[PDB]
Design a binder for this molecule. Sequence first.
Ligand SMILES: *[C@@H]1O[C@H](CO[C@H]2O[C@@H](C)[C@@H](O)[C@@H](O)[C@@H]2O)[C@@H](O[C@@H]2O[C@H](CO)[C@@H](O[C@@H]3O[C@H](CO)[C@@H](O)[C@H](O)[C@@H]3O)[C@H](O)[C@H]2NC(C)=O)[C@H](O)[C@H]1NC(C)=O
Ligand SMILES: *[C@@H]1O[C@H](CO[C@H]2O[C@@H](C)[C@@H](O)[C@@H](O)[C@@H]2O)[C@@H](O[C@@H]2O[C@H](CO)[C@@H](O[C@@H]3O[C@H](CO)[C@@H](O)[C@H](O)[C@@H]3O)[C@H](O)[C@H]2NC(C)=O)[C@H](O)[C@H]1NC(C)=O
Ligand SMILES: *[C@@H]1O[C@H](CO[C@H]2O[C@@H](C)[C@@H](O)[C@@H](O)[C@@H]2O)[C@@H](O[C@@H]2O[C@H](CO)[C@@H](O[C@@H]3O[C@H](CO)[C@@H](O)[C@H](O)[C@@H]3O)[C@H](O)[C@H]2NC(C)=O)[C@H](O)[C@H]1NC(C)=O
Ligand SMILES: *[C@@H]1O[C@H](CO[C@H]2O[C@@H](C)[C@@H](O)[C@@H](O)[C@@H]2O)[C@@H](O[C@@H]2O[C@H](CO)[C@@H](O[C@@H]3O[C@H](CO)[C@@H](O)[C@H](O)[C@@H]3O)[C@H](O)[C@H]2NC(C)=O)[C@H](O)[C@H]1NC(C)=O
Ligand SMILES: *[C@@H]1O[C@H](CO)[C@@H](O[C@@H]2O[C@H](CO)[C@@H](O)[C@H](O)[C@H]2NC(C)=O)[C@H](O)[C@H]1NC(C)=O
Ligand SMILES: *[C@@H]1O[C@H](CO)[C@@H](O[C@@H]2O[C@H](CO)[C@@H](O)[C@H](O)[C@H]2NC(C)=O)[C@H](O)[C@H]1NC(C)=O
Ligand SMILES: *[C@@H]1O[C@H](CO)[C@@H](O[C@@H]2O[C@H](CO)[C@@H](O)[C@H](O)[C@H]2NC(C)=O)[C@H](O)[C@H]1NC(C)=O
Ligand SMILES: *[C@@H]1O[C@H](CO)[C@@H](O[C@@H]2O[C@H](CO)[C@@H](O)[C@H](O)[C@H]2NC(C)=O)[C@H](O)[C@H]1NC(C)=O
Ligand SMILES: *[C@@H]1O[C@H](CO)[C@@H](O[C@@H]2O[C@H](CO)[C@@H](O)[C@H](O)[C@H]2NC(C)=O)[C@H](O)[C@H]1NC(C)=O
Ligand SMILES: *[C@@H]1O[C@H](CO)[C@@H](O[C@@H]2O[C@H](CO)[C@@H](O)[C@H](O)[C@H]2NC(C)=O)[C@H](O)[C@H]1NC(C)=O
Ligand SMILES: *[C@@H]1O[C@H](CO)[C@@H](O[C@@H]2O[C@H](CO)[C@@H](O)[C@H](O)[C@H]2NC(C)=O)[C@H](O)[C@H]1NC(C)=O
Ligand SMILES: *[C@@H]1O[C@H](CO)[C@@H](O[C@@H]2O[C@H](CO)[C@@H](O)[C@H](O)[C@H]2NC(C)=O)[C@H](O)[C@H]1NC(C)=O
Ligand SMILES: [Ca+2]
Ligand SMILES: [Ca+2]
Ligand SMILES: [Ca+2]
Ligand SMILES: [Ca+2]
Lengths: 388, 388, 388, 388
Amino acid sequence: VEYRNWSKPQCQITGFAPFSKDNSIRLSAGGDIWVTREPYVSCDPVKCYQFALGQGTTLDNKHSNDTVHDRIPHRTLLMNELGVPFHLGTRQVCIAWSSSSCHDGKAWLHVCITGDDKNATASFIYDGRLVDSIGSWSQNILRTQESECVCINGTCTVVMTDGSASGRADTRILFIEEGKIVHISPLAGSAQHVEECSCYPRYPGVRCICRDNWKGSNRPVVDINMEDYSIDSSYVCSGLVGDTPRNDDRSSNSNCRDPNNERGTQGVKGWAFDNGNDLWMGRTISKDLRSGYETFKVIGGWSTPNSKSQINRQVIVDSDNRSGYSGIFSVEGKSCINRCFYVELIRGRKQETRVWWTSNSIVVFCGTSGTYGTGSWPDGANINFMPI
Amino acid sequence: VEYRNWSKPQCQITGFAPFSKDNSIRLSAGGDIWVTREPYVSCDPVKCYQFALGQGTTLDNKHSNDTVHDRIPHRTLLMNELGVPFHLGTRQVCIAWSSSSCHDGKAWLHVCITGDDKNATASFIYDGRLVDSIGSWSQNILRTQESECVCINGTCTVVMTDGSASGRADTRILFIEEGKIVHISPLAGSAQHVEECSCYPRYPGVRCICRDNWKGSNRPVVDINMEDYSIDSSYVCSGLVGDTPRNDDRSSNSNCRDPNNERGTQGVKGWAFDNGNDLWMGRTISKDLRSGYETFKVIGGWSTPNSKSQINRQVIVDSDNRSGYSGIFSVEGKSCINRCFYVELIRGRKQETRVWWTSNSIVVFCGTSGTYGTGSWPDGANINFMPI
Amino acid sequence: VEYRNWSKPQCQITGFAPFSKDNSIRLSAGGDIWVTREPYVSCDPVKCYQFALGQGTTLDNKHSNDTVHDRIPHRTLLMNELGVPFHLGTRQVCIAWSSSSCHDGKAWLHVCITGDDKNATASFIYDGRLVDSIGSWSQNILRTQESECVCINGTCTVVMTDGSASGRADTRILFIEEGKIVHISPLAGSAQHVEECSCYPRYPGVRCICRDNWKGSNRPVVDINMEDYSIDSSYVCSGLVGDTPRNDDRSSNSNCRDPNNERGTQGVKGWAFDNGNDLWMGRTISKDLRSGYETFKVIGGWSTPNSKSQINRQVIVDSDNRSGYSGIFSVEGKSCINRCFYVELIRGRKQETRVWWTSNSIVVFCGTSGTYGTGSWPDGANINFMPI
Amino acid sequence: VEYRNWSKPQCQITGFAPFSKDNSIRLSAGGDIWVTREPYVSCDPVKCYQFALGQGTTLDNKHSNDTVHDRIPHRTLLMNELGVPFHLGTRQVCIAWSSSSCHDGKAWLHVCITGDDKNATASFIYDGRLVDSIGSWSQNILRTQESECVCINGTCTVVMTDGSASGRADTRILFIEEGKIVHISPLAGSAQHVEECSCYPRYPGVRCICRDNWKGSNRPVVDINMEDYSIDSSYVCSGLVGDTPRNDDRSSNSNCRDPNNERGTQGVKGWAFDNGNDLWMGRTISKDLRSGYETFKVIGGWSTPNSKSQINRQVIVDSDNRSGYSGIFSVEGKSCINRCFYVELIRGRKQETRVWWTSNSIVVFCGTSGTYGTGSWPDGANINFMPI
Ligand SMILES: *[C@@H]1O[C@H](CO[C@H]2O[C@@H](C)[C@@H](O)[C@@H](O)[C@@H]2O)[C@@H](O[C@@H]2O[C@H](CO)[C@@H](O[C@@H]3O[C@H](CO)[C@@H](O)[C@H](O)[C@@H]3O)[C@H](O)[C@H]2NC(C)=O)[C@H](O)[C@H]1NC(C)=O
Ligand SMILES: *[C@@H]1O[C@H](CO[C@H]2O[C@@H](C)[C@@H](O)[C@@H](O)[C@@H]2O)[C@@H](O[C@@H]2O[C@H](CO)[C@@H](O[C@@H]3O[C@H](CO)[C@@H](O)[C@H](O)[C@@H]3O)[C@H](O)[C@H]2NC(C)=O)[C@H](O)[C@H]1NC(C)=O
Ligand SMILES: *[C@@H]1O[C@H](CO[C@H]2O[C@@H](C)[C@@H](O)[C@@H](O)[C@@H]2O)[C@@H](O[C@@H]2O[C@H](CO)[C@@H](O[C@@H]3O[C@H](CO)[C@@H](O)[C@H](O)[C@@H]3O)[C@H](O)[C@H]2NC(C)=O)[C@H](O)[C@H]1NC(C)=O
Ligand SMILES: *[C@@H]1O[C@H](CO[C@H]2O[C@@H](C)[C@@H](O)[C@@H](O)[C@@H]2O)[C@@H](O[C@@H]2O[C@H](CO)[C@@H](O[C@@H]3O[C@H](CO)[C@@H](O)[C@H](O)[C@@H]3O)[C@H](O)[C@H]2NC(C)=O)[C@H](O)[C@H]1NC(C)=O
Ligand SMILES: *[C@@H]1O[C@H](CO)[C@@H](O[C@@H]2O[C@H](CO)[C@@H](O)[C@H](O)[C@H]2NC(C)=O)[C@H](O)[C@H]1NC(C)=O
Ligand SMILES: *[C@@H]1O[C@H](CO)[C@@H](O[C@@H]2O[C@H](CO)[C@@H](O)[C@H](O)[C@H]2NC(C)=O)[C@H](O)[C@H]1NC(C)=O
Ligand SMILES: *[C@@H]1O[C@H](CO)[C@@H](O[C@@H]2O[C@H](CO)[C@@H](O)[C@H](O)[C@H]2NC(C)=O)[C@H](O)[C@H]1NC(C)=O
Ligand SMILES: *[C@@H]1O[C@H](CO)[C@@H](O[C@@H]2O[C@H](CO)[C@@H](O)[C@H](O)[C@H]2NC(C)=O)[C@H](O)[C@H]1NC(C)=O
Ligand SMILES: *[C@@H]1O[C@H](CO)[C@@H](O[C@@H]2O[C@H](CO)[C@@H](O)[C@H](O)[C@H]2NC(C)=O)[C@H](O)[C@H]1NC(C)=O
Ligand SMILES: *[C@@H]1O[C@H](CO)[C@@H](O[C@@H]2O[C@H](CO)[C@@H](O)[C@H](O)[C@H]2NC(C)=O)[C@H](O)[C@H]1NC(C)=O
Ligand SMILES: *[C@@H]1O[C@H](CO)[C@@H](O[C@@H]2O[C@H](CO)[C@@H](O)[C@H](O)[C@H]2NC(C)=O)[C@H](O)[C@H]1NC(C)=O
Ligand SMILES: *[C@@H]1O[C@H](CO)[C@@H](O[C@@H]2O[C@H](CO)[C@@H](O)[C@H](O)[C@H]2NC(C)=O)[C@H](O)[C@H]1NC(C)=O
Ligand SMILES: [Ca+2]
Ligand SMILES: [Ca+2]
Ligand SMILES: [Ca+2]
Ligand SMILES: [Ca+2]
């Protein structure tokens, strides 16, 4: 095989279609299944694989107690064929409490981060081996995407952040070839605070719709020039707004340039993508907590500022159900590259107090140009049924 | 590899021989096994795989309660090598409460249907990716075969129905190439109500022996012309009759043209196939409920109307045991293409009331030209032993 | 690949060396493992696989009760890489209560037998498909080897028996090519009663050391001429004697020609092989029940009648432990074809009455030309620990 | 493929980076996982596999009681892809209570030892078959490395010992090609007692840093000349000292030539490797028991005697946690061959008395030339949570 170049236009879509569902939680009630969080998906040239950072235990395990915590030395990245649940035979590809993964065309690149919060180490494992590594630069939680990185012509991009979870941080874009760090670009542009990036190829460059955790409800954009390693950044134009927390659609706005300063602190891993002057996005239905999920196109949402005109809406998860993080993944077709997405459905502790654990399920949809319907596909577990 | 064309005569058979049995239920009593219904089998050029629509839980799981229901957002299609049981490592290839699957020669085509009964969406996933999709046309339960579709020269056929489960519906035949819908043919002919088709290659065309759920006990035939996408339909000639419910062999009949109007409402997924003027079929032994299974040739059962003369009978499942749906699958040999079949053995709720669940087992036989014997191969689980 | 021809001399051995052990039973006490009996092993050109006829349930399952019975419609053949235990992911390759399996060089040939004792059917599945089948000829338990068959130049041999378990039976040798029965040879020679054959290549022919269940304690030999399909038969010469039951070494004998008529009724699947005028064999240490296992060469045990002079003895299983059936399997090396063997270690019911089940473990040794030691490798399960 | 020759310089490192962690024990509390000890890792040209000698039972099994014992007839070697835990589907490649394994470039070589302590047999299984075997030479526990052997130009080295665990023994280096023993070299040099060797390629020869169990706290070196099969031996120069037990850094020393005679009896499988005049090693932090693990370079630790000057220290396992054996494994990169290591973390009996079993977990780090941080990665199981 040769290197992936993602040289084909984007497919023109009408909406999305059901792709996969793992049903992890319902299964946990009667089977040895892993405790997870922060899942995502990628596809090499032939098939897709689902990932997630495990918690070092099975759900029906006394060790699952107090799993709300994001960072312990036992979290490792697990990889399986999309659709087969995280059973004991699953593979732990590395030690990591934060990750990103991508296939350049020749093989897989895994970026796993771990260690002490003030002095973490991030490993780059290419083609099954450790090729390079980097240590924390701001000594305050070195972190990254929690979803696929992308490669073009054998160079894969990854954006990491170190520093304040609610103040000026130090965001950088890394270029690695064959597992080795070839260049490092420091963030530039108007974007005030970048987190958990949401990247997708847009030849000849890569685009990320990230999370602003300090002063923004609107989402930051980070354009990466694969050529001279240049970087531009801003906020989406769409007057709707896809972060949580946020103001209601009537009291919302963005100018494409600076944080809207409305319920800016906190956030959630989100996504969006361009379609000419238009924009396709997804957000939780509630503006306060992570509940429900719906998607829609916003006419003029990319080019015009404060665009609120929406259409082609579909609810993935209904108003009454819990969701979580979200990401996008691109797949190469016969004539165009297609855009897909997954939804992490979290259940348990800190929100549902019967149990003492925290884990999650996933659902993924892919874009289509045909016709479709309506429905709702949530986790589906009866919190009252077994396990803790 | 090149595309499958199924260009070889049909093998001349004497009866059938034991092929496989999964024993799912006996195993469920002491192991983490999935809850299933509507199973089937297909074989790519080298090996056969067994499928079924799961219920999103393990049998020994509190979530298995009230599994009688045919449609929830958690049913997904599972695929395994024929003979290995549905364990936790099994793969959920898509979200679906109704499906069909086939291999064109180059890869697999999965047609999975899901969502709200009045507004369902059916996905076409070819070579591991989502390529097209279609929405409901009559807003009343869009459905399909629940067994393999077939491809000739890289074009695969699938027949779907939307509408009344006991009245005029809207049946259509879809032609898809490489995952994309290339043409749609509306039903024609004398067949009054088509359901859960039973298709098999008969170069240069495809033939389906379906289920009539409204006015017929006799079974409808749907001939598909791979050339001009033409479609003819009728009812089998055989005076015996292979549906359930039905009249006893003495008070039965068909004229090859219209529903026999005898105990027509309701039915069960069934099968049959031509052998010159003769016919090979299988039906449950009881005329009222789904119990037992036997097979036989009916001399003149294809060409002559109301043919009751039978021979070469074998009981697969004895009078005293439960069965269920049934399908056929064709396999290419060195000189002729051979016809096989599976039997879904359902156990549990709505019929056996000790337990609160519903699941099933399978047994499959393949045609032979040699000699064989007699016996009975049912599920084999002691309803009194464990699980609920 | 081309067809296997087994054209290399036999390796000259000094004794045997430890190869594999599955530890099934110890594992059953804390894991979902199958209930088995009549195991064996074969190796395709690259690796060995272990087989056994399952009982349609897990050990820690209420369905394991009364597993002593040799024939129910739920026994199917299971295949795994030698050394990985029979877990739920294991593959049931066919329905069978008696079998034999072999690889011709191009693929696998599975001969599985099942159905009613008076009217059984045996299936021939080649390269994953059903190619032929045969029905019972004496209506009294059609049976076969319970270990590998062998192929030379693409023709595989298998010996079946039908009839009296303790009287004149009808033994036949089947020749099948690519799954199809090409010729059938009826037994000839002096051998009075042939059962559970023990075959191995000895180019240009095949040799089997079977079990005499009627009038013999000495073992019958069945020579098959791959050329004209000719068949000769006799009894081993060795004055020792390798069947159970039997007379003690002082009151034993054979003349190479007829049954020794000493404790002839009953028996156990056994083995032996030529080494010039010498013979290598293995037998249980006890002359009454199946306990212990030891192997040795008998100087002149092939050519001279009533040879009792033995040497190079090794105990595999000590006097105090249970064993069971036994078989041989040949493996191709760089310059000679090597002879190996497995021992089935049965535990449970009809002999150990704490539990209500019956299952088994295996141990396998391969010939060597180097040096070795001593020891004992039995099942190893504490009948007092868990399960029933 | 052709034979591995390991012809590339050693990579120049700065320290080590996190690679893998299996979390076996936490998982055992809620899942069927094997009981292990003496683990290690090797990598064929494309991927790494983790090994360990099982105990013939699952942890949550009554059979796990009294697992402290190093040698029973039920221990067999298990192999899995590095990172997937020892579940029931795991493969037992051979019967062994002591082993070593390596890939010559063409395939795997497994050396498994078993039987009676006074008369053991060691098997050589190449490319899936038994090719040779050897019997004990001193009749007092024949043993070997418990970690990978190495091959250069298709000849693999392995060092075995037989005799006194605390007195003069008989150590030998075996050369085997394609599974066959081609030459045997008896130990020579100043090294007083060699055990559990720690070998790594250093073209054109192989080097081992072993364990001295009789009179030394410093570690012996065994240089093997792949050419004339010559052998030299000594003790490391470093005044620090990497064995346990040992004297504290202030009262320690070595002269590179003879045992330092300080707390010499007993020991633990350890490691080290040259870097010009420098040395990279790892040892438990405590000088008395196997607790904690730290690594560092000792300036001049190879060439100069009694070198105590250290730098670049990292703690893998903190002072407060249990560790165990340790080994190294080399991996080929694009321009240099890289050095890695694993740590066996043992938990349970004879030290932690709540439970009646003994098993272990693993953590592995690989060298890097980039930057890294700090942290601690121990087993992580709550001895109070479940299992015994
Ligand atoms: C999951 O989490 C909390 C805390 O459990 C931890 O306990 C420590 C010691 C350690 O083992 C760690 O691995 C565990 O995760 C548990 O909540 C406890 O609930 C009981 C309710 O009665 C409280 O009772 C009190 O417990 C003390 C001893 O701690 C008794 O002596 C007192 O009399 C009193 O009853 C207990 O303190 C709770 N602690 C907190 C912080 O809420 C929870 O039970 C645990 N287990 C489960 C099944 O979820
Ligand atoms: C499987 O199905 C039925 C219904 O269970 C559902 O319960 C709801 C609340 C939800 O959790 C859902 O996931 C469950 O599937 C169960 O049948 C019940 O049997 C008991 C027998 O005593 C009935 O008793 C009554 O129950 C009420 C509370 O519902 C009590 O307060 C009353 O005093 C009275 O005892 C119960 O109502 C039944 N309901 C029906 C509709 O039959 C069944 O038990 C369940 N579980 C199992 C193991 O099969
Ligand atoms: C395994 O086998 C035997 C027989 O069990 C079978 O029972 C039938 C009904 C069916 O379910 C089948 O699947 C089972 O395999 C069991 O042995 C029995 O042991 C009890 C000891 O008390 C006997 O007691 C008597 O049982 C009758 C009802 O059968 C009572 O009403 C009487 O009062 C009396 O107590 C029982 O008859 C035994 N039968 C025989 C033939 O020995 C065995 O328990 C079973 N189970 C287990 C765990 O091994
Ligand atoms: C794990 O190990 C020890 C020994 O168990 C072995 O028992 C033998 C018979 C065999 O089954 C083997 O497989 C087992 O491994 C167990 O320790 C025992 O603890 C009890 C505590 O009360 C002791 O009590 C005494 O036991 C005798 C019978 O042995 C009674 O009749 C006396 O009245 C008295 O209570 C017992 O002797 C202990 N033995 C030793 C050597 O410590 C341990 O319980 C076992 N099981 C578990 C769960 O760890
Ligand atoms: C992206 O990769 C494709 C796929 O490899 C490139 O296509 C080749 O490039 C041109 C287009 O016809 C010709 O020189 C070759 O015949 C093509 N063949 C194949 C197999 O790809 C494509 O050009 C690449 N795009 C870019 C911008 O480099
Ligand atoms: C990705 O690689 C393609 C494939 O070579 C690049 O396109 C070529 O650009 C070079 C110089 O950069 C020219 O010499 C060729 O004429 C162009 N096309 C081909 C098919 O060779 C492309 O510039 C690279 N793009 C990115 C984003 O790195
Ligand atoms: C169905 O496919 C077969 C198998 O590919 C076709 O066979 C080829 O067609 C003719 C028959 O000899 C020759 O031109 C080729 O030499 C055949 N070779 C191979 C490998 O198939 C067969 O013709 C096809 N049938 C139809 C009706 O198209
Ligand atoms: C299936 O494909 C075969 C293979 O080409 C078709 O048979 C050929 O038909 C074409 C035009 O349709 C002729 O030009 C060839 O001479 C015929 N045979 C071959 C081997 O090329 C066949 O018509 C197709 N059948 C179906 C049902 O689609
Ligand atoms: C058994 O098979 C082998 C292996 O295929 C045959 O060897 C060939 O036969 C002769 C011996 O040199 C030559 O004509 C070929 O060069 C050999 N090559 C290969 C790859 O095998 C062997 O002859 C066969 N034995 C018999 C009796 O037919
Ligand atoms: C197995 O096949 C070999 C390979 O051909 C046979 O040996 C040849 O015999 C034929 C006629 O039978 C001769 O024409 C050749 O000269 C012989 N050798 C070779 C290498 O071709 C052998 O007879 C067959 N043996 C068996 C037992 O079937
Ligand atoms: C070790 O193996 C390598 C890899 O196979 C050898 O490299 C070959 O040897 C020389 C170096 O260029 C040339 O003759 C070949 O062109 C090389 N090609 C390949 C694919 O390896 C290397 O020489 C070996 N080292 C030693 C000391 O033998
Ligand atoms: C490993 O193999 C290489 C590859 O051949 C050996 O290097 C060659 O040595 C031979 C004679 O030993 C010379 O004829 C060649 O000129 C040398 N190089 C090559 C690339 O062929 C090397 O000696 C062997 N090393 C070891 C440790 O066994
Ligand atoms: Ca925010
Ligand atoms: Ca009907
Ligand atoms: Ca006998
Ligand atoms: Ca020591």
